[PDB]
């Protein structure tokens, strides 16, 4: 929670619109749509059937984590 919160507040600070935080930070759909869903656009496009770019290793680690986690269950 503390790291999600810090990260999103500083993303909205560094981008420019603190208004997006001060409005969408008060209801959980704001978090799910405006932080987890919007910001994972360039991540999962790390590789596709069209090519790949710098953040392909991250886009592979990103699934690696889930795999370990689900094995954890």
């Amino acid at each position: 929670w503390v790291t999600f919160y810090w990260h999103w507040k500083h993303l909205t600070l560094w981008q420019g619109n603190v208004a997006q935080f001060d409005e969408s930070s008060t209801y959980l759909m704001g978090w799910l749509r405006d932080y987890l869903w919007l910001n994972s656009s360039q991540l999962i496009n790390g590789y596709n059937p069209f090519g790949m770019n710098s953040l392909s290793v991250w886009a592979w680690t990103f699934l690696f984590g889930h795999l370990i986690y689900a094995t954890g269950f």
């Binding site: 959980l28 759909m29 869903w37 994972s40 590789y47 790949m52 392909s56 290793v57 886009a59 699934l63």
Partner: protein, 740 residues
């Protein structure tokens, strides 16, 4: 000598035992002292083997309970027909099926929920239904809301009849045992009466109401001008106008000149091109043939006259060299135990449900069904899930028969005995094949993922790189597409359009187009096979190791449901057959989730979409063959791309889904507390809070106890399934109601 055997007034009718909770068992009766007793009151309510030890009383109980279940079903159906009659736009839908979406529920104008009333078309406001009663009603011929209201009243009356019947047969005229143990008479009457005469009667209704009314509705006349069906029964000449065979009456039937009924009993194949459903003449012909088949099958067994078979003779005649005595002793098993019957019947019942789902998307039977995408998706998904649950139940009750009602003295050298006697070979090989399918079916996806991320897409399994073609399914597809010319000379078309051929478009949308099978299909099919085999492993292992094992030599004496046998011999958590059912529930969830994801994405990518007279533009553009070999493909193109409608539904008339999404997540994550943790910690915490109440003299005189181990696990899996399935429900409905 099969006959009626009924006892008189066994149990009187009084409210006396309603004020005495837990009256049924000896243990429960003495009253509560802990909070475990409440959950024990609810846990053993229907365990009809745990009140008494006599067959007759249990049988009477289950008979009347069946009546109760039927009654509640009738109340439900009556509710559906009533809501269709009063709070819907059914007539406005009949006037124009396209562009007017089915709605059958209206909410009250309070705190703001009135935004849920959507603009469904037709001057009406409410919540769109996907249950698809409207297409069913148009298939039956219903044109007015009055007939729906009458059907509602009839349903309610039948419900009261059922509850009275249950009361009568438990309290006033309760049958004896040997009424129940006449399985052969029951087979004859069910096969003939229920299935057969139901088919014959419904064929009658189709031929005399549903064929002509739908012929007029598809002819283009509005539903009010269409004659009422009793005018179709009474006036022969109107039927003679529609189908000239009726002008000859029933003379062709009784003189075996059936070829003159070729106007309303047909064999044409594909679909109704103006409607999108099956031809109703085929449907009537189908039920006629079904009825003849079942009425023939129902005269097979011996009841009172010399003709017919005996079940014991048939069973005892089948025994070979590899199986010793064969089936000798299964008749005594299957007439004296209810859990064995429940196992077999739940098994075949659930599998039947899944077959229902498959045929129901492949060959759409109801008029204007195939172009209502949400209805298609919801019906297939719903029947899939019900099938899965029923099969897991089959596993559970087979285990219960293994624990309780199995007696080895009546069962010596036998199919059941030999299965128990090489359970080790069985489970070992099933384990092997599970691991083999695991490595290959999932490692293909991991390999494609790795290769597609390392810069070389030429070393992954796909349609353009190294190829894996389902040659068998493609060959079968072509076989059936070619069938109407060699191996079915009298049909005019194939039985469905998924086998190949042309395209049927109703109102701009696609009813059904041929489906092709490529490498992604190969891989997902083997995923399905893998998860099915794993679930079979868990459940069958539970059944076979329910009485004893190498670990516990006396697992039978501990019963069906028990938590452990201590931390000894290493630790023996979860050795009951019940916990095998538990883990089976988890894997059933997994397998069926994959199945319905496969269906949803495959349909949105290769079948549905609009016919824009520029080829076909599907909903997602046809990306299944290129993306369904990478886990990143699923996570991006399916979960991340297709969630844009369920997450942005706020403010529209669709926000209930985008609000039940999050709640489903919450319950899913709430299950984990019950799954991960254990009851000793909660017992101690509850003890400290009990101290905090002892300080203020609010000690409850019933004692707070934490849940037992088995209950904690069960509650965990309940919340798990509820949250997961609710999430998938919300996602599917928001997506396909939004863009479909």
């Amino acid at each position: 000598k099969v006959k009626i055997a009924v006892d008189r007034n066994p149990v009187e009718t009084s409210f006396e035992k309603w004020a005495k909770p837990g009256h049924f068992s000896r243990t429960l009766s003495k009253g509560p002292n802990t909070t475990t007793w409440i959950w024990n009151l609810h846990a053993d309510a229907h365990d009809f083997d745990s009140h008494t030890s006599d067959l007759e009383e249990i049988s009477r109980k289950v008979f009347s309970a069946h009546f109760g279940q039927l009654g509640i079903i009738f109340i439900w159906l009556s509710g559906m027909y009533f809501h269709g009659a009063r709070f819907s736009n059914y007539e406005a839908w009949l006037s124009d099926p396209t562009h007017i979406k089915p709605s059958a529920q209206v909410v009250w104008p309070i705190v703001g929920q009135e935004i849920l009333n959507g603009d469904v078309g037709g001057g009406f406001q409410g919540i769109q239904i996907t249950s698809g009663f409207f297409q069913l009603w148009r298939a039956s011929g219903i044109t007015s809301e009055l007939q729906l209201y009458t059907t509602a009243i009839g349903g309610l009356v039948m419900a009261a009849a059922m509850f009275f019947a249950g009361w009568f047969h438990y309290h006033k005229a309760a049958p004896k045992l040997e009424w129940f143990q006449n399985v052969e008479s029951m087979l004859n009457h069910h096969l003939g009466g229920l299935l057969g005469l139901g088919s014959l009667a419904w064929a009658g209704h189709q031929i005399h109401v549903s064929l002509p009314v739908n012929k007029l509705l598809d002819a283009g006349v509005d539903p009010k001008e269409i004659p009422l069906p009793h005018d179709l029964l009474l006036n022969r000449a109107i039927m003679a106008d529609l189908y000239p065979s009726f002008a000859k009456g029933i003379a062709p039937f009784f003189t075996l000149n059936w070829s003159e009924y070729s106007d309303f009993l047909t064999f044409k194949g594909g679909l109704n091109p103006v409607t999108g459903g099956l031809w109703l003449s085929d449907t009537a012909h189908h039920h006629v043939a079904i009825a003849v088949l079942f009425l023939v099958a129902g005269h097979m067994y011996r009841t009172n006259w010399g003709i017919g078979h005996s079940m014991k003779e048939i069973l005892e005649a089948h025994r070979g060299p590899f199986t010793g005595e064969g089936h000798v002793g299964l008749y005594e098993i299957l007439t004296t135990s209810w859990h064995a019957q429940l196992a077999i019947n739940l098994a075949l019942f659930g599998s039947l449900s899944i077959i229902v789902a498959h045929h129901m998307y492949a060959m759409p039977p109801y008029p204007y069904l195939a172009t209502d995408y949400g209805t298609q998706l919801s019906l297939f998904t719903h029947h899939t899930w019900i099938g899965g649950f029923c099969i897991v139940g089959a596993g559970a009750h087979a285990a219960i028969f293994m624990v309780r009602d199995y007696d080895p003295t009546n069962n010596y050298n036998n199919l059941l005995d030999r299965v128990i006697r090489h359970r080790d070979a069985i489970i070992s090989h099933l384990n092997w094949v599970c691991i083999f399918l695991g490595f290959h079916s999932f490692g293909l996806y991991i390999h494609n993922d790795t290769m597609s991320a390392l810069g070389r897409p030429q070393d992954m399994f796909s349609d353009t790189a190294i190829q894996l073609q389902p040659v068998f399914a493609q060959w079968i597809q072509n076989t059936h597409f070619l069938a109407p010319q060699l191996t079915a000379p009298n049909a005019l078309a194939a039985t469905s359009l998924t086998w190949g051929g042309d395209l049927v478009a109703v109102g701009g949308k696609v009813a059904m187009m041929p489906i092709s099978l490529g490498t992604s299909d190969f891989m997902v099919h083997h995923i399905h096979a893998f998860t099915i085999h794993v679930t079979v492993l868990i459940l069958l292992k539970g059944v076979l190791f329910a009485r004893s094992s190498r670990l516990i030599p006396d697992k039978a004496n501990l019963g069906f449901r028990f938590p452990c046998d201590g931390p000894g011999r290493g630790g023996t958590c979860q050795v009951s057959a019940w916990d095998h059912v538990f883990l089976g529930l988890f894997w059933m969830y997994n397998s069926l989730s994959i199945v319905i994801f496969h269906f949803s994405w495959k349909m949105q990518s290769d079948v549905w979409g609009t016919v824009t007279a520029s080829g076909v533009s599907h909903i997602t553009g046809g990306n299944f063959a290129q993306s369904a070999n990478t886990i990143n493909g699923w996570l991006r193109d399916f979960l991340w791309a297709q969630s844009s409608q369920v997450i942005q539904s706020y403010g529209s008339a669709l926000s209930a889904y985008g609000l039940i999404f999050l709640g489903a997540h919450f319950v899913w994550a709430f299950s984990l507390m019950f799954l991960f943790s254990g009851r000793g910690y909660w017992q101690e915490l509850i003890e400290s809070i009990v101290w905090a109440h002892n300080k203020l003299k609010v000690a409850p005189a019933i004692q707070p106890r934490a849940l037992s181990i088995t209950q904690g696990r069960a509650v965990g899996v309940a919340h798990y399934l509820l949250g997961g399935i609710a999430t998938t429900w919300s996602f599917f409905l928001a997506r396909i109601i939004s863009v479909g």
